[PDB]
Structure 1
Amino acid sequence: NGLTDRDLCELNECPLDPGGYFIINGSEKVLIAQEKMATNTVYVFAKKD
């Protein structure tokens, strides 16, 4: 964080890389957002059967 282009290049890290991923055992893992029903909101549904 906070490093400019020069330090990132000197540090063997791509300036253009957006980041946003973890590194576990050398494999770059990225979390994916998961949808779920909104909490604390009364709904109404009509089950057909």
Structure 2
Amino acid sequence: STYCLLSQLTDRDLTELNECPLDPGGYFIINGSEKVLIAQEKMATNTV
């Protein structure tokens, strides 16, 4: 994301920190567990 430490880093900088340059991210780390948030369908509010 923008506010994380892996923001706009190069492949060499990600590799030196033992991170995958091909990793897209998109997940939280909660207690060492990778958690992903699923988008939920809902009705369109304020619609007749």
Provide the identity percentage. 93
Q: TM-score under structure 2 normalisation? A: 0.83
Greater length-normalized contact order (CA 8 Å, ≥ 6 residues apart): 2
Q: Structure 1: which 5+ residue stretches go unaligned?
A: 42-49
Aligned to 1:10: 16
RMSD across aligned C-alpha pairs, in angstroms? 0.4
Query: Greater Rg, structure 1 or structure 2?
Result: 1
Runs in 1 of length 4+ with deviation above 6 angstroms?
none
Task: Measure, in 1, the Cα distance between the counterparts of 2:18 and 2:44.
Answer: 42
Structure 2 residues not aligned, in runs of 5+:
1-6
